Motif scaffolding. Structure first.
Motif, PDB file in Angstrom:
ATOM      1  N   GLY A  33       0.801  -1.204   0.000  1.00 27.65           N
ATOM      2  CA  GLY A  33       0.000   0.000   0.000  1.00 27.65           C
ATOM      3  C   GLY A  33       0.837   1.258   0.000  1.00 27.65           C
ATOM      4  N   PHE A  34       0.330   2.311   0.639  1.00 28.72           N
ATOM      5  CA  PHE A  34       1.097   3.544   0.732  1.00 28.72           C
ATOM      6  C   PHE A  34       1.560   3.798   2.157  1.00 28.72           C
ATOM      7  N   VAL A  35       0.712   3.476   3.136  1.00 33.21           N
ATOM      8  CA  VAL A  35       1.029   3.740   4.534  1.00 33.21           C
ATOM      9  C   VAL A  35       2.174   2.853   5.004  1.00 33.21           C
ATOM     10  N   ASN A  36       2.241   1.623   4.504  1.00 37.20           N
ATOM     11  CA  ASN A  36       3.344   0.748   4.849  1.00 37.20           C
ATOM     12  C   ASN A  36       4.628   1.131   4.136  1.00 37.20           C
ATOM     13  N   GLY A  37       4.546   1.964   3.098  1.00 38.64           N
ATOM     14  CA  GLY A  37       5.752   2.543   2.532  1.00 38.64           C
ATOM     15  C   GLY A  37       6.496   3.405   3.531  1.00 38.64           C
ATOM     16  N   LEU A  38       5.770   4.253   4.253  1.00 37.67           N
ATOM     17  CA  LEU A  38       6.437   5.044   5.273  1.00 37.67           C
ATOM     18  C   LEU A  38       6.599   4.273   6.572  1.00 37.67           C
ATOM     19  N   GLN A  39       5.885   3.163   6.754  1.00 36.01           N
ATOM     20  CA  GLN A  39       6.274   2.246   7.818  1.00 36.01           C
ATOM     21  C   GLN A  39       7.651   1.672   7.543  1.00 36.01           C
ATOM     22  N   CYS A  40       7.922   1.317   6.295  1.00 32.05           N
ATOM     23  CA  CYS A  40       9.254   0.869   5.939  1.00 32.05           C
ATOM     24  C   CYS A  40      10.271   1.998   5.935  1.00 32.05           C
ATOM     25  N   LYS A  41       9.833   3.253   5.856  1.00 30.21           N
ATOM     26  CA  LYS A  41      10.789   4.345   5.972  1.00 30.21           C
ATOM     27  C   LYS A  41      11.302   4.483   7.394  1.00 30.21           C
ATOM     28  N   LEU A  42      10.420   4.797   8.334  1.00 35.90           N
ATOM     29  CA  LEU A  42      10.808   4.923   9.727  1.00 35.90           C
ATOM     30  C   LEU A  42      10.313   3.688  10.455  1.00 35.90           C
ATOM     31  N   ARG A  43      11.240   2.972  11.084  1.00 34.20           N
ATOM     32  CA  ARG A  43      11.023   1.591  11.510  1.00 34.20           C
ATOM     33  C   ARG A  43      10.073   1.563  12.705  1.00 34.20           C
ATOM     34  N   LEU A  44       8.805   1.802  12.404  1.00 31.50           N
ATOM     35  CA  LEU A  44       7.759   1.847  13.410  1.00 31.50           C
ATOM     36  C   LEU A  44       6.513   1.332  12.711  1.00 31.50           C
ATOM     37  N   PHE A  45       5.733   0.505  13.403  1.00 31.29           N
ATOM     38  CA  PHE A  45       4.688  -0.243  12.716  1.00 31.29           C
ATOM     39  C   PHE A  45       3.359   0.494  12.744  1.00 31.29           C
ATOM     40  N   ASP A  46       2.909   0.892  13.925  1.00 27.52           N
ATOM     41  CA  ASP A  46       1.700   1.685  14.092  1.00 27.52           C
ATOM     42  C   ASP A  46       2.102   3.121  14.404  1.00 27.52           C
ATOM     43  N   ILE A  47       2.333   3.903  13.361  1.00 23.34           N
ATOM     44  CA  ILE A  47       3.030   5.179  13.477  1.00 23.34           C
ATOM     45  C   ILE A  47       2.041   6.232  13.963  1.00 23.34           C
ATOM     46  N   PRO A  48       2.426   7.084  14.909  1.00 23.37           N
ATOM     47  CA  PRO A  48       1.495   8.063  15.459  1.00 23.37           C
ATOM     48  C   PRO A  48       1.284   9.203  14.482  1.00 23.37           C
ATOM     49  N   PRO A  49       0.225  10.018  14.650  1.00 22.09           N
ATOM     50  CA  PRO A  49       0.041  11.166  13.751  1.00 22.09           C
ATOM     51  C   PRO A  49       1.117  12.226  13.888  1.00 22.09           C
ATOM     52  N   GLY A  50       1.393  12.918  12.797  1.00 23.07           N
ATOM     53  CA  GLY A  50       2.502  13.846  12.744  1.00 23.07           C
ATOM     54  C   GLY A  50       2.947  14.020  11.310  1.00 23.07           C
ATOM     55  N   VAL A  51       3.801  15.014  11.107  1.00 24.91           N
ATOM     56  CA  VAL A  51       4.412  15.247   9.809  1.00 24.91           C
ATOM     57  C   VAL A  51       5.676  14.404   9.743  1.00 24.91           C
ATOM     58  N   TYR A  52       5.893  13.759   8.604  1.00 21.37           N
ATOM     59  CA  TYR A  52       7.039  12.879   8.447  1.00 21.37           C
ATOM     60  C   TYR A  52       7.781  13.252   7.183  1.00 21.37           C
ATOM     61  N   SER A  53       8.981  13.772   7.370  1.00 21.90           N
ATOM     62  CA  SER A  53       9.715  14.452   6.324  1.00 21.90           C
ATOM     63  C   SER A  53      10.451  13.464   5.439  1.00 21.90           C
ATOM     64  N   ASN A  54      10.703  13.914   4.208  1.00 21.77           N
ATOM     65  CA  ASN A  54      11.742  13.380   3.336  1.00 21.77           C
ATOM     66  C   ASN A  54      11.473  11.932   2.941  1.00 21.77           C
ATOM     67  N   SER A  55      10.263  11.649   2.483  1.00 25.96           N
ATOM     68  CA  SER A  55       9.962  10.302   2.024  1.00 25.96           C
ATOM     69  C   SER A  55      10.105  10.281   0.505  1.00 25.96           C
ATOM     70  N   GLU A  56      10.866   9.302   0.026  1.00 26.41           N
ATOM     71  CA  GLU A  56      11.380   9.319  -1.338  1.00 26.41           C
ATOM     72  C   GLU A  56      10.415   8.654  -2.308  1.00 26.41           C
ATOM     73  N   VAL A  57      10.725   8.764  -3.602  1.00 29.57           N
ATOM     74  CA  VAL A  57      10.046   7.998  -4.643  1.00 29.57           C
ATOM     75  C   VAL A  57      11.090   7.242  -5.449  1.00 29.57           C
TER      76      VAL A  57
END
Ligand SMILES: *[C@@H]1O[C@H](CO)[C@@H](O)[C@H](O)[C@H]1NC(C)=O
Ligand SMILES: *[C@@H]1O[C@H](CO)[C@@H](O)[C@H](O)[C@H]1NC(C)=O
Ligand SMILES: *[C@@H]1O[C@H](CO)[C@@H](O)[C@H](O)[C@H]1NC(C)=O
Lengths: 49, 49
Positions: free
Chosen positions: A25-49
């Motif tokens: 999916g898309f949400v697990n893309g940033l789960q794989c970015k920052l090594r946290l599974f159920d990530i809390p709300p917040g801004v998360y910088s610098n996610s690549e393509v």
């Protein structure tokens, strides 16, 4: 067919018990970015393509 | 100085304005580096090494 870069949780005995492929999916893309599974709300910088 | 015991104190007759501009550096651009994709590009053979 090709590679995968899955996130892995692991319990007290070192055994894996939860996981999430990064391309499902898309949400697990940033789960794989920052090594946290159920990530809390917040801004998360610098996610690549 | 506080004056006592009268003496030949010199006082100024006129002043002048002096602008003393004073730069204090206070910001820099906040950065969000990603070393996984800086040190090596889309090549996977880096990222397992
Ligand atoms: C892993 O975390 C759980 C949750 O607190 C804890 O009960 C367990 O002792 C931890 N494992 C180790 C080896 O500390
Ligand atoms: C005030 O007293 C001090 C010390 O007694 C002395 O040196 C000074 O000359 C005195 N002031 C005047 C105006 O005489
Ligand atoms: C002292 O400052 C005043 C104000 O700028 C000016 O008019 C005057 O010429 C100055 N005196 C001298 C000796 O430069």
């Amino acid at each position: 067919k090709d590679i995968s870069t899955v996130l892995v949780e692991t319990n007290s005995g070192g055994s894996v018990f939860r996981y999430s492929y990064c391309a499902d999916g898309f949400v697990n893309g940033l789960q794989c970015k920052l090594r946290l599974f159920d990530i809390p709300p917040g801004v998360y910088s610098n996610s690549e393509v | 100085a506080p004056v006592t015991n009268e003496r030949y104190t010199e006082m100024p007759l006129d002043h002048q304005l002096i602008l003393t501009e004073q730069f204090l550096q206070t910001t820099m651009p906040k950065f969000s580096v990603s070393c996984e994709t800086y040190i090596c590009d889309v090549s996977k053979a880096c990222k397992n090494l």
